[PDB]
Amino acid sequence: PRVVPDQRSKFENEEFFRKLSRECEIKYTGFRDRPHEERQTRFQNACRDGRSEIAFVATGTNLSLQFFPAPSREYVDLEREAGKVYLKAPMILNGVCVIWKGWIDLHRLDGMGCLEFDEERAQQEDALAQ
């Protein structure tokens, strides 16, 4: 059971998701015990690799992000607004296929982000379960 049957409702109802749908404040959690200089080079270089550790400050819910489908100019974007990074990555959170969307300031190492259901991947996965 990689996913929950009521995949669509579980996301449109449960508080856990509703409070994470809005444009909540996010932040880089990586190496919080090191010089800011280092946290910057680590966060960016890691993004170019398609991964990063981001957590929703407000709720405090951490998440390990994998910027890939299933190097990737589409997901990990570094164009829009020089100095920022508009990352993106899917995942199965609590039996609910979703996608993570947000941005982070290459200097402040934080920003905003949110979640959203994944019609397609949810469908596919819901099939594997039959």
């Binding site: 059971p1 990689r2 996913v3 929950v4 856990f16 932040k27 959690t29 919080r32 015990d33 550790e53 957590a55 929703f56 400050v57 407000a58 709720t59 405090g60 819910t61 951490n62 998440l63 390990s64 994998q66 890939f68 299933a70 899917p90 995942m91 199965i92 959170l93 609590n94 039996g95 991947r121």
Partner: protein, 118 residues
């Protein structure tokens, strides 16, 4: 095997103390068990946080999956959760795509931890 349900329908985890001293080894080794089928070698990582600490400092929060079991060797909590408040565990099984199972109000970590009243 004293397991407990997680926020994901595909994962279970061992029981954790309700209160514990930071940087202190746990009474029982933490484990993550997959209901479905996960390929051996798959990495599993743990993370924690809440309103008072957006991301707690952990030690050895990484483990490899083997026979549907990820044994965390000496997982410790360094970051504190706050007076009365608890941590929200975020387990992540690195598959493609990666699966994540949370566990709210999992454990409370403080300086002294469990301690008789004076």
């Amino acid at each position: 095997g004293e397991l407990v349900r997680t926020d994901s329908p595909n994962f279970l985890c061992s029981v954790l103390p309700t209160h514990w001293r930071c940087n202190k080894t746990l009474p029982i080794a933490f484990k993550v068990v997959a209901k479905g089928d996960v390929p051996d070698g798959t990495l599993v990582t743990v993370m924690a946080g809440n309103d008072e600490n957006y991301s707690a400092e952990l030690r050895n929060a990484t483990a490899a999956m083997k026979n549907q079991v990820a044994r965390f060797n000496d997982l410790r909590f360094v970051g504190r959760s706050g007076r009365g408040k608890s941590f929200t565990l975020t387990i992540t099984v690195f598959t493609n795509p990666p699966q994540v199972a949370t566990y709210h109000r999992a454990i409370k970590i403080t300086g002294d931890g469990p301690r008789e009243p004076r």
